[PDB]
Amino acid sequence: LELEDNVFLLLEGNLKRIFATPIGYTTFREFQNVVFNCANGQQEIANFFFEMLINGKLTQELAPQQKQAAHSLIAEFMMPIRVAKDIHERGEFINFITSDMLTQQERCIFLNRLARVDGQEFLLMTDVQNTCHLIRHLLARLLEAQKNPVGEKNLQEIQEEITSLKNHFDELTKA
Amino acid sequence: LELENVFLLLEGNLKRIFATPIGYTTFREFQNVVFNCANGQQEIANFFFEMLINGKLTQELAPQQKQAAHSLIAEFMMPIRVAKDIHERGEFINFITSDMLTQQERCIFLNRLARVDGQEFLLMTDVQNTCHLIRHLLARLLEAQKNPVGEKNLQEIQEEITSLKNHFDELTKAL
Amino acid sequence: LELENVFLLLEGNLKRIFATPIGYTTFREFQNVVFNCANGQQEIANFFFEMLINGKLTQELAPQQKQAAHSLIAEFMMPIRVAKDIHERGEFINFITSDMLTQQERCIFLNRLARVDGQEFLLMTDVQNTCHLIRHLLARLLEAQKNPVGEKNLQEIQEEITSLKNHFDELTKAL
Amino acid sequence: LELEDNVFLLLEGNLKRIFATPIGYTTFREFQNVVFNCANGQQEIANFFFEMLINGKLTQELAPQQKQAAHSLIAEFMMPIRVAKDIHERGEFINFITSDMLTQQERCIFLNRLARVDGQEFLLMTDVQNTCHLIRHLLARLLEAQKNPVGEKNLQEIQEEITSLKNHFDELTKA
Amino acid sequence: LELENVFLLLEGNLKRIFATPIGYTTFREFQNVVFNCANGQQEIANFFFEMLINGKLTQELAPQQKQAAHSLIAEFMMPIRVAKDIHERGEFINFITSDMLTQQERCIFLNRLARVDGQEFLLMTDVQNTCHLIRHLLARLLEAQKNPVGEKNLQEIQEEITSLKNHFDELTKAL
Amino acid sequence: LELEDNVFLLLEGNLKRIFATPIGYTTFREFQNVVFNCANGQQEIANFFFEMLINGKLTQELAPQQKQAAHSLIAEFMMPIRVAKDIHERGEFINFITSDMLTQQERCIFLNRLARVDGQEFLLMTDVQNTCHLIRHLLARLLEAQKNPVGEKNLQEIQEEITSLKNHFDELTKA
């Protein structure tokens, strides 16, 4: 492989540009387009940068200044690229939830925040009854998954986590 | 009370403010409209509020005015009530749907959460995510139980908690 | 069938769910409302569904009930149909507008894309962007043509494709 | 120019802060305000940092530790600043589009994603007929640009790209 | 003019386009609907536009058609006017609310800004933020005063400016 | 404290991941969860990383390679973490506003952009009268704050900034 220093520099500027705005569902494909543009029709060069930037792996010896630049690109871009790829694949999946209990009047309510893999969040208020209905709805859904052969195998994989839920619930009912 | 074609002018104004999505300012924009149509007079405004919020006519009206009044009530009472609801509790959960899908040996759920204000959020969960969400929400019920107000709330929904019992039983047993 | 003031209670409930923007949960929220007004009975629910979805009364009603029924049909049949449309195809394109502007020696277009669900997106393009978008979309038609199902779809719209012909002709010739 | 090391440090913290959240339409102006605040009414200091951070150019010799810090600031912030400036100028222009063909039933449809320079994206579904109508609409718009003297010159600039579109289309029609 | 059940077909179509939130394309979508119902004829379209935009019937109609026409006017004239307003000035401020709260020795305000298009934005300010915003806006009035057009605008609102005077007086004096 | 180099590496990857998407209201809590996971139930390790990453302070001597990694983590993540914490606390507060005056026809209007601490922005158009009404509304709000003991103390703190507003306004009225 014969690369000029200029390629690493141009590639860095282009990657800095695409990652300057929020990662979205087009970002992984936009990154691939940047690599292909840089490779200029040379599959071996494209693959070199994909291995480097997607896998953090250097598939040939580089001269010291280029090796340093590759390490810098890996450090700066590997995770954001993997997150772009993740969003492309499963950006709408739940990633995190927070809840803050507020006690007002007679009533205990929760300010819940739902965050997805793609970073979008949603605020949702629930009182204690809403919370119970939400739990029942989600349990009803696992019970339907359990009838299906795939769902059944998925549930058997976390059988310990399920038995625990029942524990926590038995703990709530006694009190 | 003494009133002019106030009903038609009230109508045109209510049609305008309700032609766009109802928001958190809409109930107050409505009050401002009523105030303006009453020329600021509190007795007349109150007559309109009773009519429009509670559907109650506090005064006999000539046939033509009475016809317009019943029309305003049919057309606006519920949207006004929803605007007040949103002002008060717009961020609370209102509805949830889930569609079960099977992708790559995984049972997954496309959930949609809708609030009182009509905003919705799409959230994907797999079986393990669903279990974690349930654990999270259960923990909130436990948190409420430790707070004197929340504990009273829980005591009011015994039939709700028993329902969670039977679902938890069915799931654990079926595995 | 035996029915109570069910029409008025149905009305108030439909007015409430349609007072906020229609979303992807709205058709299902409607079904739940009908179910609840029918006290769960499938024959009564079906009577309401025929009435409200298809505008068909499957039963003679006293004058007062019949009046309320025609009113529910006029007020809700189309919003119900749109809610079902959105549930099914809410993300599909519905309308596009373009306004041509001239800025700094450039012809530019302010495009607005609107979906079946009513969400809109503003997108600016210059002449070269517009050309690239067209090239992209053309490539999709070529992609569909390589798929046996897509190829059948294309064969159904011969008059559409000829229209593209005449536009392409006019443009190339005029340059 | 007489700068204390403290200025580079304070400037870095302030820039890190403003770039911690998504770039928006106010971000370039917010950056200018940070520079002016740091310059403290000294135009020569403001200009030094603007040349450095907007143009990547150092307009006077710096001592080695400050030169290193300037290079670090350039590497970290030059591209995001240029993107902020770009968004300020043309954030609503199209930047990228992806499409995924889905074959279901009899029908080939495309899940399109529209991304703007500002990073916002929009999902749009199209079937084969929608795609054709979109193409015709966009061609109609170029034809109107062609009547206008500016638009005509813009089109002559990409005359080769246009002739190519016609090619791709002639290729689609034969098949 | 010669017309068919055009009123009912017009009705169903208007009900459909107004069933979703009004957007920036809605007025144009309406015009397209009218065009299509008129079978493209400009005289018939104009009859519908007068009826639907201005509430004016430019033609005597049989009792049944006349009834349908008055119904279309009552149901759609205002939403059409709002759609045109939005097309023209959707981003302009329409309403603002503020609720004053006290948190941690601070007086704070929960402000909500609503535009002509119905979109809203929540914005918190403390006392100093509120002062800065006011200073900003005052500076804009000063900017307009330096522009010959803006200076004319200011001269038209003398009673508005005096109101700012009395408020400014009350505040400074009370401190 | 006995940490393996692997901990710094794992921690960096996890932080890079969470900061790859827009900071939101859950991000500070997500960061705490990452630290606790890394500490693996060891409060002293959690506190070491919290002091390091929240306060930029190293609470024990590290070997040179680990000290270098800690400095790198501080440089990369301290500000974004502080911004996450800020958003958690006051993300909805105003952060910045820009205005651009547009002169069209007889009329001077302003394209205002409102940016919050959380990075969300809102575009709002105002003409000269809207601007005056907005000022009056905000002054009315400060006048109400002045009646309240807390608000009064807040206002006394910026008494100089208030007197200045009055100045700028007196300057506008003379002209």
Side-chain angles (χ1 to χ4, degrees), chain A residues 1 3-175, chain B residues 1-172 174-175, chain C residues 1-172 174-175, chain D residues 1 3-175, chain E residues 1-172 174-175, chain F residues 1 3-175:
Chain A
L1 216 37
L3 302 158
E4 50 275 54
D5 284 346
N6 212 31
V7 179
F8 287 85
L9 192 55
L10 261 114
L11 182 57
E12 182 184 66
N14 285 316
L15 294 169
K16 283 178 174 296
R17 185 166 320 107
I18 70 181
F19 287 103
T21 49
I23 296 177
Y25 289 76
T26 62
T27 302
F28 184 71
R29 271 171 295 202
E30 186 174 11
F31 155 77
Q32 292 181 300
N33 181 65
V34 163
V35 174
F36 285 127
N37 284 348
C38 283
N40 198 8
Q42 184 137 1
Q43 184 184 249
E44 51 271 47
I45 292 172
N47 289 343
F48 173 68
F49 285 119
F50 287 136
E51 292 290 359
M52 173 195 311
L53 297 173
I54 293 170
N55 296 333
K57 170 60 154 55
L58 295 183
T59 63
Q60 50 162 7
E61 182 82 5
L62 294 165
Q65 292 186 7
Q66 290 194 341
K67 189 181 292 181
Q68 288 187 342
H71 289 329
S72 177
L73 288 176
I74 289 173
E76 188 166 355
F77 296 111
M78 182 175 57
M79 291 304 323
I81 292 161
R82 300 174 75 69
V83 170
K85 192 171 185 146
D86 209 28
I87 289 176
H88 190 329
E89 297 172 340
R90 48 191 295 278
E92 291 157 330
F93 280 74
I94 183 171
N95 182 62
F96 204 80
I97 178 180
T98 61
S99 295
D100 296 291
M101 192 165 72
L102 315 160
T103 304
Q104 52 198 229
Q105 64 180 20
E106 315 214 86
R107 218 155 85 102
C108 269
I109 58 166
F110 296 94
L111 186 174
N112 307 287
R113 289 173 193 284
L114 290 287
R116 305 191 313 197
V117 167
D118 68 6
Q120 300 199 29
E121 296 177 334
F122 194 61
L123 183 154
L124 187 67
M125 310 294 300
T126 52
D127 61 13
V128 155
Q129 185 178 39
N130 297 143
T131 304
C132 179
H133 292 170
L134 215 38
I135 294 169
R136 187 194 49 207
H137 174 92
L138 298 168
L139 283 176
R141 304 288 78 67
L142 292 184
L143 282 169
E144 289 199 24
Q146 196 278 144
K147 301 301 290 187
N148 174 271
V150 180
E152 209 272 350
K153 296 277 178 49
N154 289 173
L155 284 159
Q156 287 297 339
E157 261 121 33
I158 57 168
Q159 180 177 25
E160 300 168 279
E161 306 181 42
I162 282 96
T163 300
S164 178
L165 287 183
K166 185 52 154 49
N167 289 342
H168 286 355
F169 172 79
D170 285 357
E171 159 189 8
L172 174 303
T173 57
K174 73 179 173 202
Chain B
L1 308 179
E2 178 70 271
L3 320 151
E4 313 62 17
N5 62 186
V6 67
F7 288 97
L8 251 68
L9 291 170
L10 192 46
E11 185 185 80
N13 279 293
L14 298 172
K15 282 173 170 301
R16 176 182 274 280
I17 72 181
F18 284 104
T20 51
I22 298 180
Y24 291 80
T25 61
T26 305
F27 185 68
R28 273 166 295 195
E29 187 178 11
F30 156 73
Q31 292 179 309
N32 187 69
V33 164
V34 173
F35 178 93
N36 294 345
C37 293
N39 293 309
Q41 314 170 243
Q42 137 114 349
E43 206 163 16
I44 298 205
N46 285 162
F47 164 74
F48 287 131
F49 285 133
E50 278 296 341
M51 173 184 127
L52 289 169
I53 298 175
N54 301 337
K56 179 186 189 290
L57 297 194
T58 65
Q59 181 142 333
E60 293 304 292
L61 298 163
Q64 291 79 16
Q65 279 184 328
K66 185 177 187 190
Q67 193 73 308
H70 285 313
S71 176
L72 287 175
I73 281 165
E75 182 171 7
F76 300 104
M77 184 182 71
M78 285 298 327
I80 292 160
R81 300 185 70 85
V82 168
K84 191 159 176 289
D85 281 337
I86 287 177
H87 171 112
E88 297 170 348
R89 50 189 296 278
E91 295 160 315
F92 276 79
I93 188 175
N94 181 61
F95 203 72
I96 184 178
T97 65
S98 304
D99 297 292
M100 190 174 69
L101 310 163
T102 291
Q103 301 181 2
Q104 295 124 341
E105 307 304 7
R106 325 221 48 222
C107 263
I108 64 168
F109 305 92
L110 189 172
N111 308 289
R112 301 176 184 278
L113 304 157
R115 310 191 308 199
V116 171
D117 70 2
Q119 296 194 37
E120 297 183 336
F121 195 58
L122 184 156
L123 188 67
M124 304 295 305
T125 59
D126 64 12
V127 159
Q128 189 170 32
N129 296 148
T130 303
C131 181
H132 290 354
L133 179 58
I134 287 175
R135 185 176 306 264
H136 175 87
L137 295 163
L138 223 32
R140 308 285 65 80
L141 293 186
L142 283 157
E143 185 179 359
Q145 191 274 318
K146 302 296 177 37
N147 180 269
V149 168
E151 207 278 343
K152 300 209 304 284
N153 297 162
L154 288 168
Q155 290 297 342
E156 301 175 347
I157 56 168
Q158 151 72 315
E159 293 177 350
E160 295 302 320
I161 302 274
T162 291
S163 180
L164 292 183
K165 157 180 177 55
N166 312 322
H167 280 76
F168 276 120
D169 286 345
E170 187 175 352
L171 188 65
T172 62
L175 299 170
Chain C
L1 308 179
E2 178 70 271
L3 320 151
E4 313 62 17
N5 62 186
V6 67
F7 288 97
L8 251 68
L9 291 170
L10 192 46
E11 185 185 80
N13 279 293
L14 298 172
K15 282 173 170 301
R16 176 182 274 280
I17 72 181
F18 284 104
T20 51
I22 298 180
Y24 291 80
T25 61
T26 305
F27 185 68
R28 273 166 295 195
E29 187 178 11
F30 156 73
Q31 292 179 309
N32 187 69
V33 164
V34 173
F35 178 93
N36 294 345
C37 293
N39 293 309
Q41 314 170 243
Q42 137 114 349
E43 206 163 16
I44 298 205
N46 285 162
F47 164 74
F48 287 131
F49 285 133
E50 278 296 341
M51 173 184 127
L52 289 169
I53 298 175
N54 301 337
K56 179 186 189 290
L57 297 194
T58 65
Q59 181 142 333
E60 293 304 292
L61 298 163
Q64 291 79 16
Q65 279 184 328
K66 185 177 187 190
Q67 193 73 308
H70 285 313
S71 176
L72 287 175
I73 281 165
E75 182 171 7
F76 300 104
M77 184 182 71
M78 285 298 327
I80 292 160
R81 300 185 70 85
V82 168
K84 191 159 176 289
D85 281 337
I86 287 177
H87 171 112
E88 297 170 348
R89 50 189 296 278
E91 295 160 315
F92 276 79
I93 188 175
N94 181 61
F95 203 72
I96 184 178
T97 65
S98 304
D99 297 292
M100 190 174 69
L101 310 163
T102 291
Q103 301 181 2
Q104 295 124 341
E105 307 304 7
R106 325 221 48 222
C107 263
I108 64 168
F109 305 92
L110 189 172
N111 308 289
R112 301 176 184 278
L113 304 157
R115 310 191 308 199
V116 171
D117 70 2
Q119 296 194 37
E120 297 183 336
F121 195 58
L122 184 156
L123 188 67
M124 304 295 305
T125 59
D126 64 12
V127 159
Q128 189 170 32
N129 296 148
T130 303
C131 181
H132 290 354
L133 179 58
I134 287 175
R135 185 176 306 264
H136 175 87
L137 295 163
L138 223 32
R140 308 285 65 80
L141 293 186
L142 283 158
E143 185 179 359
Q145 191 274 318
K146 302 296 177 37
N147 180 269
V149 168
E151 207 278 343
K152 300 209 304 284
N153 297 162
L154 288 168
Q155 290 297 342
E156 301 175 347
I157 56 168
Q158 151 72 315
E159 293 177 350
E160 295 302 320
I161 302 274
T162 291
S163 180
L164 292 183
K165 157 180 177 55
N166 312 322
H167 280 76
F168 276 120
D169 286 345
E170 187 175 352
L171 188 65
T172 62
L175 299 170
Chain D
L1 216 37
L3 302 158
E4 50 275 54
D5 284 346
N6 212 31
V7 179
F8 287 85
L9 192 55
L10 261 114
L11 182 57
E12 182 184 66
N14 285 316
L15 294 169
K16 283 178 174 296
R17 185 166 320 107
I18 70 181
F19 287 103
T21 49
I23 296 177
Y25 289 76
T26 62
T27 302
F28 184 71
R29 271 171 295 202
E30 186 173 11
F31 155 77
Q32 292 181 300
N33 181 65
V34 163
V35 174
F36 285 127
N37 284 349
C38 283
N40 198 8
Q42 184 137 1
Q43 184 184 249
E44 51 271 47
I45 292 172
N47 289 343
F48 173 68
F49 285 119
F50 287 136
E51 292 290 359
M52 173 195 311
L53 297 173
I54 293 170
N55 296 333
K57 170 60 154 55
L58 295 183
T59 63
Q60 50 162 7
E61 182 82 5
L62 294 165
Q65 292 186 7
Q66 290 194 341
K67 189 181 292 181
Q68 288 187 342
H71 289 329
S72 177
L73 288 176
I74 289 173
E76 188 166 355
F77 296 111
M78 182 175 57
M79 291 304 323
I81 292 161
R82 300 174 75 69
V83 170
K85 192 171 185 146
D86 209 28
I87 290 176
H88 190 329
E89 297 172 340
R90 48 191 295 278
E92 291 157 330
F93 280 74
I94 183 171
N95 182 62
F96 204 80
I97 178 180
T98 61
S99 295
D100 296 291
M101 192 165 72
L102 315 160
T103 304
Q104 52 198 229
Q105 64 180 20
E106 315 214 86
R107 218 155 85 102
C108 269
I109 58 166
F110 296 94
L111 186 174
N112 307 287
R113 289 173 193 284
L114 290 287
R116 305 191 313 197
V117 167
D118 68 6
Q120 300 199 29
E121 296 177 334
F122 194 61
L123 183 154
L124 187 67
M125 310 294 300
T126 52
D127 61 13
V128 155
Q129 185 178 39
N130 297 143
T131 304
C132 179
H133 292 170
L134 215 38
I135 294 169
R136 187 194 49 207
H137 174 92
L138 298 168
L139 283 176
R141 304 288 78 67
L142 292 184
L143 282 169
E144 289 199 24
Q146 196 278 144
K147 301 301 290 187
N148 174 271
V150 180
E152 209 272 350
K153 296 277 178 49
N154 289 173
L155 284 159
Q156 287 297 339
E157 261 121 33
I158 57 168
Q159 180 177 25
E160 300 168 279
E161 306 181 42
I162 282 96
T163 300
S164 178
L165 287 183
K166 185 52 154 49
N167 289 342
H168 286 355
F169 172 79
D170 285 357
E171 159 189 8
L172 174 303
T173 57
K174 73 179 173 202
Chain E
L1 308 179
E2 178 70 271
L3 320 151
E4 313 62 17
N5 62 186
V6 67
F7 288 97
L8 251 68
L9 291 170
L10 192 46
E11 185 185 80
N13 279 293
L14 298 172
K15 282 173 170 301
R16 176 182 274 280
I17 72 181
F18 284 104
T20 51
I22 298 180
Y24 291 80
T25 61
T26 305
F27 185 68
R28 273 166 295 195
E29 187 178 11
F30 156 73
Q31 292 179 309
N32 187 69
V33 164
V34 173
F35 178 93
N36 294 345
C37 293
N39 293 309
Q41 314 170 243
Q42 137 114 349
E43 206 163 16
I44 298 205
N46 285 162
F47 164 74
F48 287 131
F49 285 133
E50 278 296 341
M51 173 184 127
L52 289 169
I53 298 175
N54 301 337
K56 179 186 189 290
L57 297 194
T58 65
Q59 181 142 333
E60 293 304 292
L61 298 163
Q64 291 79 16
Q65 279 184 328
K66 185 177 187 190
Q67 193 73 308
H70 285 313
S71 176
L72 287 175
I73 281 165
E75 182 171 7
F76 300 104
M77 184 182 71
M78 285 298 327
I80 292 160
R81 300 185 70 85
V82 168
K84 191 159 176 289
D85 281 337
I86 287 177
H87 171 112
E88 297 170 348
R89 50 189 296 278
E91 295 160 315
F92 276 79
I93 188 175
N94 181 61
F95 203 72
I96 184 178
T97 65
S98 304
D99 297 292
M100 190 174 69
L101 310 163
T102 291
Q103 301 181 2
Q104 295 124 341
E105 307 304 7
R106 325 221 48 222
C107 263
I108 64 168
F109 305 92
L110 189 172
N111 308 289
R112 301 176 184 278
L113 304 157
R115 310 191 308 199
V116 171
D117 70 2
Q119 296 194 37
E120 297 183 336
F121 195 58
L122 184 156
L123 188 67
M124 304 295 305
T125 59
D126 64 12
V127 159
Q128 189 170 32
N129 296 148
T130 303
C131 181
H132 290 354
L133 179 58
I134 287 175
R135 185 176 306 264
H136 175 87
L137 295 163
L138 223 32
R140 308 285 65 80
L141 293 186
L142 283 157
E143 185 179 359
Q145 191 274 318
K146 302 296 177 37
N147 180 269
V149 168
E151 207 278 343
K152 300 209 304 284
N153 297 162
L154 288 168
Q155 290 297 342
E156 301 175 347
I157 56 168
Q158 151 72 315
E159 293 177 350
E160 295 302 320
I161 302 274
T162 291
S163 180
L164 292 183
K165 157 180 177 55
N166 312 322
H167 280 76
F168 276 120
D169 286 345
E170 187 175 352
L171 188 65
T172 62
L175 299 170
Chain F
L1 216 37
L3 302 158
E4 50 275 54
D5 284 346
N6 212 31
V7 179
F8 287 85
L9 192 55
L10 261 114
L11 182 57
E12 182 184 66
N14 285 316
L15 294 169
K16 283 178 174 296
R17 185 166 320 107
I18 70 181
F19 287 103
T21 49
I23 296 177
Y25 289 76
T26 62
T27 302
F28 184 71
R29 271 171 295 202
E30 186 174 11
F31 155 77
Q32 292 181 300
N33 181 65
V34 163
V35 174
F36 285 127
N37 284 348
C38 283
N40 198 8
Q42 184 137 1
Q43 184 184 249
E44 51 271 47
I45 292 172
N47 289 343
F48 173 68
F49 285 119
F50 287 136
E51 292 290 359
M52 173 195 311
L53 297 173
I54 293 170
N55 296 333
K57 170 60 154 55
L58 295 183
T59 63
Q60 50 162 7
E61 182 82 5
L62 294 165
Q65 292 186 7
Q66 290 194 341
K67 189 181 292 181
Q68 288 187 342
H71 289 329
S72 177
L73 288 176
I74 289 173
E76 188 166 355
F77 296 111
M78 182 175 57
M79 291 304 323
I81 292 161
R82 300 174 75 69
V83 170
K85 192 171 185 146
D86 209 28
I87 289 176
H88 190 329
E89 297 172 340
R90 48 191 295 278
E92 291 157 330
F93 280 74
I94 183 171
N95 182 62
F96 204 80
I97 178 180
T98 61
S99 295
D100 296 291
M101 192 165 72
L102 315 160
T103 304
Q104 52 198 229
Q105 64 180 20
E106 315 214 86
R107 218 155 85 102
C108 269
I109 58 166
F110 296 94
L111 186 174
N112 307 287
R113 289 173 193 284
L114 290 287
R116 305 191 313 197
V117 167
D118 68 6
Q120 300 199 29
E121 296 177 334
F122 194 61
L123 183 154
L124 187 67
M125 310 294 300
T126 52
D127 61 13
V128 155
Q129 185 178 39
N130 297 143
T131 304
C132 179
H133 292 170
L134 215 38
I135 294 169
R136 187 194 49 207
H137 174 92
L138 298 168
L139 283 176
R141 304 288 78 67
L142 292 184
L143 282 169
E144 289 199 24
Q146 196 278 144
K147 301 301 290 187
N148 174 271
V150 180
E152 209 272 350
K153 296 277 178 49
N154 289 173
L155 284 159
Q156 287 297 339
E157 261 121 33
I158 57 168
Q159 180 177 25
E160 300 168 279
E161 306 181 42
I162 282 96
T163 300
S164 178
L165 287 183
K166 185 52 154 49
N167 289 342
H168 286 355
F169 172 79
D170 285 357
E171 159 189 8
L172 174 303
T173 57
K174 73 179 173 202

